[PDB]
Amino acid sequence: EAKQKIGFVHGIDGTIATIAPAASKVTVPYNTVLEIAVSATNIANALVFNLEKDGSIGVILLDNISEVRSGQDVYATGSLLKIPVGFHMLGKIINPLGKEIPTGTKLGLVEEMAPNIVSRQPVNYNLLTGYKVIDTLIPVGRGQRELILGDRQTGKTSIALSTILNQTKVNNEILSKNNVLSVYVSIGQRCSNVARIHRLLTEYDAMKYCTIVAATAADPAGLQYLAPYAGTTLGEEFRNSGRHILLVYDDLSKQAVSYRQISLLLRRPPGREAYPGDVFYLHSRLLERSAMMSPQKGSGSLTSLPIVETLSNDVTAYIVTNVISITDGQIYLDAKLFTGGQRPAVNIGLSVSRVGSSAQNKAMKKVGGALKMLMGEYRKMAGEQTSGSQNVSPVMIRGARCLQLFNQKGPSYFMDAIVALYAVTNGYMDDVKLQYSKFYEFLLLNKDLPVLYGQVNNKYFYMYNKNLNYFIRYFGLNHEILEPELKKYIEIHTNLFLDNYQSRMNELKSDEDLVQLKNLLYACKRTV
Amino acid sequence: RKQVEELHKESPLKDYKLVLETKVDPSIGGGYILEVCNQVVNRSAAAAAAETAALAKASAAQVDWTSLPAAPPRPSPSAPDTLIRLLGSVVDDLADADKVEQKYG
Amino acid sequence: DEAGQDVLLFVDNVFRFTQANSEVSALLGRIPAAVGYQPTLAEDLGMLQERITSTVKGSITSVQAVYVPADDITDPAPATTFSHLDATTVLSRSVAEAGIYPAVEPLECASRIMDPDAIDVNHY
Amino acid sequence: AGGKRYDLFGYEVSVATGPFIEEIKKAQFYDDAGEVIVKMNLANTPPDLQTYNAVLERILNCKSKRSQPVKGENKFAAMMDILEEMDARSGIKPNAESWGYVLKELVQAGDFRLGWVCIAGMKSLGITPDQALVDANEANAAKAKAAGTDFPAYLKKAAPESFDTKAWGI
Amino acid sequence: GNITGLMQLADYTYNKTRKELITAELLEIIGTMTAMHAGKKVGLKKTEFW
Numbered sequence: 001e002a003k004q005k006i007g008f009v010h011g012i013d014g015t016i017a018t019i020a021p022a023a024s025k026v027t028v029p030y031n032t033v034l035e036i037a038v039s040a041t042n043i044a045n046a047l048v049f050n051l052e053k054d055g056s057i058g059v060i061l062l063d064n065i066s067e068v069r070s071g072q073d074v075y076a077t078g079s080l081l082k083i084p085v086g087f088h089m090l091g092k093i094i095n096p097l098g099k100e101i102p103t104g105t106k107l108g109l110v111e112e113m114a115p116n117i118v119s120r121q122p123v124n125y126n127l128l129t130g131y132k133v134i135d136t137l138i139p140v141g142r143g144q145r146e147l148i149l150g151d152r153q154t155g156k157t158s159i160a161l162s163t164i165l166n167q168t169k170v171n172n173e174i175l176s177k178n179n180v181l182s183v184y185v186s187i188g189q190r191c192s193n194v195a196r197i198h199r200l201l202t203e204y205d206a207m208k209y210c211t212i213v214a215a216t217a218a219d220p221a222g223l224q225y226l227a228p229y230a231g232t233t234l235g236e237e238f239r240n241s242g243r244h245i246l247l248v249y250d251d252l253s254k255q256a257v258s259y260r261q262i263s264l265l266l267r268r269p270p271g272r273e274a275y276p277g278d279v280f281y282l283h284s285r286l287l288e289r290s291a292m293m294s295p296q297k298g299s300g301s302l303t304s305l306p307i308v309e310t311l312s313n314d315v316t317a318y319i320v321t322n323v324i325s326i327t328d329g330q331i332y333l334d335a336k337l338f339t340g341g342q343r344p345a346v347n348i349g350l351s352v353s354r355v356g357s358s359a360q361n362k363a364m365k366k367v368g369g370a371l372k373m374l375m376g377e378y379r380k381m382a383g384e385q386t387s388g389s390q391n392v393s394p395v396m397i398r399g400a401r402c403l404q405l406f407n408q409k410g411p412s413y414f415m416d417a418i419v420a421l422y423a424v425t426n427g428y429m430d431d432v433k434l435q436y437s438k439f440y441e442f443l444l445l446n447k448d449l450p451v452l453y454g455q456v457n458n459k460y461f462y463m464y465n466k467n468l469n470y471f472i473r474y475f476g477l478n479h480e481i482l483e484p485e486l487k488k489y490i491e492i493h494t495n496l497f498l499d500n501y502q503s504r505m506n507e508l509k510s511d512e513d514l515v516q517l518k519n520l521l522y523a524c525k526r527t528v
Numbered sequence: 529r530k531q532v533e534e535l536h537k538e539s540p541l542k543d544y545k546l547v548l549e550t551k552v553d554p555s556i557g558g559g560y561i562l563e564v565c566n567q568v569v570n571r572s573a574a575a576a577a578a579e580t581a582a583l584a585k586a587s588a589a590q591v592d593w594t595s596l597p598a599a600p601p602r603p604s605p606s607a608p609d610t611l612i613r614l615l616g617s618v619v620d621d622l623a624d625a626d627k628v629e630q631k632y633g
Numbered sequence: 634d635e636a637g638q639d640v641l642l643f644v645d646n647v648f649r650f651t652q653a654n655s656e657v658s659a660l661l662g663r664i665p666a667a668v669g670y671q672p673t674l675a676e677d678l679g680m681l682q683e684r685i686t687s688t689v690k691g692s693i694t695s696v697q698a699v700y701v702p703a704d705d706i707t708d709p710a711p712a713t714t715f716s717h718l719d720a721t722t723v724l725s726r727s728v729a730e731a732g733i734y735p736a737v738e739p740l741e742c743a744s745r746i747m748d749p750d751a752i753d754v755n756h757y
Numbered sequence: 758a759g760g761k762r763y764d765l766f767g768y769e770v771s772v773a774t775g776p777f778i779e780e781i782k783k784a785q786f787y788d789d790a791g792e793v794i795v796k797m798n799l800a801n802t803p804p805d806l807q808t809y810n811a812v813l814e815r816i817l818n819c820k821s822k823r824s825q826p827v828k829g830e831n832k833f834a835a836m837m838d839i840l841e842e843m844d845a846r847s848g849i850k851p852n853a854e855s856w857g858y859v860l861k862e863l864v865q866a867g868d869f870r871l872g873w874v875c876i877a878g879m880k881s882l883g884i885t886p887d888q889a890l891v892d893a894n895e896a897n898a899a900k901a902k903a904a905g906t907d908f909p910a911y912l913k914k915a916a917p918e919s920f921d922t923k924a925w926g927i
Numbered sequence: 928g929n930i931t932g933l934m935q936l937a938d939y940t941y942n943k944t945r946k947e948l949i950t951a952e953l954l955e956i957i958g959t960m961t962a963m964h965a966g967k968k969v970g971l972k973k974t975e976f977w
């Protein structure tokens with residue numbers, strides 16, 4: 001095996017390198033990989049960013065930058081960047097060059113042209129984040145790239161992280177074709193956040209269906225520029241295998257910052273906010289690879305959940321203003337609500353999902369049609385009413401009861417989200433207080449009062465099997481077989497709670513018992 | 529030489545006259561380093577021995593014996609009906625206790 | 634590492650370290666960023682920050698001060714520093730003008746260890 | 758004899774689903790079957806009703822999803838996801854021969870309640886279920902009702918009176 | 928009716944100052960880029976010296 005050289009390094013500026021070529025006859029293509037011989041033993045990979053008239057190669061460095069010196073030789077591979085690919089990558093995190101990282105065959109390209117319109121399909125299947133908010137008012141379907149906005153520490157990462165843990169109970173059950181996999185992509189986040197994510201997904205046995213790509217802050221800029229690309233390539237092969245796949249980016253704004261650092265160090269022409277021109281193309285090269293493919297192309301799907309960090313609830317920034325114009329909707333989080341116990345801290349007014357109903361199932365459309373026609377009036381009433389005035393009307397009651405159900409640490413099963421929201425929108429949850437709504441929900445879902453207190457005028461419908469959602473998803477609750485059983489189970493559980501528990505609660509007008517209860521409520525908020 | 533002229537043949541150019549320029553390398557005690565028509569080939573003990581050194585490193589690194597070897601997969605319990613018949617409700621507690629013991633004990 | 638002890642690291646302050654390279658970047662030939670910062674900000678900051686992290690051998694309890702010029706949190710220098718931290722204590726001119734100290738705004742700050750599992754539930 | 762079928766965009770579509778069905782019936786495990794719908798789709802030969810029925814057949818006859826076992830395995834949900842994939846996603850509707858495999862698996866697993874659900878659904882769409890399976894369903898039902906197995910044990914357990922987080926097992 | 932007039936006047940001042948700020952950042956960047964290139968301007972200088 002003989003390698004081919006082109007020249008040596010002229011100079012470097014941190015992550016950047018310029019090349020002096022030898023044997024001027026020889027050429028190099030545009031976006032190829034270059035291998036630098038820091039020593040006879042160690043070798044550093046790099047990419048060619050631009051070329052010049054004099055004969056020189058602007059290069060971005062990806063590994064072992066500190067070892068680089070002037071006068072070193074260069075070699076060319078003759079191909080684009082590519083990474084190892086396949087099903088042998090789900091359980092392990094990697095570097096965007098494929099180098100597996102420790103923790104306590106096939107290749108694939110980073111830059112593939114996204115599928116054209118004929119190679120695609122309108123979205124019709126859902127992607128369950130596990131949260132009731134998302135699956136009701138702003139649903140995410142497969143092939144429906146949807147943004148996640150928000151300032152620091154509002155619940156951006158936790159959303160996608162629950163979106164992925166939610167897809168572990170199911171992917172075990174359903175076939176290995178409709179099992180939505182997942183790929184996290186961390187860009188510039190601290191390395192210990194990566195290991196904490198690793199231990200989290202390894203705790204829930206989710207890493208069997210979920211890999212991570214990590215280009216941490218210590219990693220160079222050009223390696224942050226390529227991470228969502230390589231994660232998209234990993235999802236692209238699964239799209240070509242017919243599978244479904246999820247894809248997360250945490251986050252793109254640091255990907256843009258890295259691209260800025262590289263263009264400005266390469267003497268490229270800057271523009272607004274010091275970014276170059278093609279940053280909107282930098283993202284459109286990536287996100288449009290997310291799609292729902294056609295049955296002619298395996299029916300695969302690649303869902304993208306790009307995270308972007310706002311600053312003081314601004315959205316007129318260049319990156320956010322561009323990514324919003326690209327995505328098929330967005331999710332807008334507010335720290336004013338993340339502090340007010342509304343966790344996730346969504347902002348339903350500014351949050352949008354252009355795929356409104358066609359992604360959702362048969363069981364969800366009838367529910368979301370009510371929830372839109374409930375919150376639409378809740379906001380007008382809560383906005384016009386005072387802060388202290390009492391209003392006895394079913395909208396201001398039921399909606400505020402719904403906002404409590406929206407608060408939840410971690411995901412929640414489908415069956416539990418529908419029975420909990422069907423109880424409210426039909427008015428069964430009008431007598432209970434605003435505070436014990438989640439305890440009511442906890443009793444409804446995991447416990448079973450009518451099975452305990454002898455009320456068993458219910459042939460099949462109970463909240464202990466958990467295989468019943470697969471009938472709900474098919475028939476839907478509006479079908480004549482589940483409607484009456486559902487209503488009887490809810491009315492009975494409501495009367496039992498209002499009689500036995502909700503009376504005992506108000507009686508505990510003590511010192512220690514109030515705290516003993518409030519810990520129970522704020523714990524039920526978490527386990528659910 | 530037999531690889532020099534042959535690599536000059538493999539090069540895009542072969543009609544050009546060949547010229548040699550030799551040097552003394554303090555790093556190499558075995559093998560040779562050659563460059564023909566911007567096609568380098570390294571046959572050197574520094575890199576050659578380091579190749580097998582990397583393989584002999586990754587081989588030892590690949591297998592770690594400190595961690596417990598993975599246990600054989602457990603099949604579904606498939607408890608018999610007679611067990612449910614003899615103890616209607618205790619059986620569930622027994623199954624939970626066995627699972628907890630398998631986690632802790 | 635070698636002694637295995639626990640360590641404190643009080644730094645006053647990171648922003649001067651940032652602007653130290655900013656005063657030079659224009660002279661090196663590096664084109665500056667939006668507000669007039671180097672383009673190498675997040676990389677140099679991470680290559681400094683990532684060294685600060687707990688390990689198997691020991692632990693570094695770092696504490697870092699920052700200068701927010703004009704009390705503008707949108708300044709990219711503090712902004713890039715969010716990700717490299719676990720407890721983003723924020724102070725404000727407003728709370729001090731009311732004669733209160735420590736001039737903390739509890740809403741505009743938050744920690745990472747604020748969980749029920751890491752600490753007491755009552756504290757949460 | 759074969760009615761023409763067209764793609765979304767009006768393109769012609771193959772229907773010779775035969776050899777893929779014979780390639781499915783040989784599936785020792787019911788996950789290579791789902792992997793064969795891919796090979797059908799990529800050849801522009803999408804799955805027919807009988808095709809998904811053969812998938813449900815091997816889902817019933819096969820023992821496990823893969824060679825090694827898997828936690829969270831369930832034949833019933835894997836069949837119902839096929840039904841949702843058939844009805845709403847694509848458009849093909851099932852038939853009595855499709856629901857028959859579902860009711861048979863509910864009988865084998867013994868989940869009598871879902872059995873009465875699938876019964877009340879088959880009778881809503883206008884389908885004649887086999888009484889031979891209804892009899893085994895009610896047999897398992899009464900068998901469980903007599904032995905107190907009508908429900909689990911942890912639901913009938915005494916409610917904790919106190920509002921303690923550890924009392925409720927949260 | 929008065930608050931709305933004050934609001935639109937503030938929305939104009941905000942949205943105008945945001946534009947002047949963006950333009951100013953461009954002027955600063957291009958000034959640094961033009962100064963570097965103008966000072967670093969390289970020429971052949973094929974003239975007699977002896």
Ligand SMILES: Nc1ncnc2c1ncn2[C@@H]1O[C@H](COP(=O)(O)OP(=O)(O)OP(=O)(O)O)[C@@H](O)[C@H]1O
Binds near residue numbers: 155407744747748
């Ligand atoms: N519903 C919830 N209930 C309780 N805590 C929550 C909830 N959702 C999120 N959190 C908490 O939010 C914290 C995570 O913050 P998050 O990941 O949103 O920050 P971030 O946006 O990633 O920050 P940065 O933008 O700097 O990366 C954790 O402490 C997590 O427990």
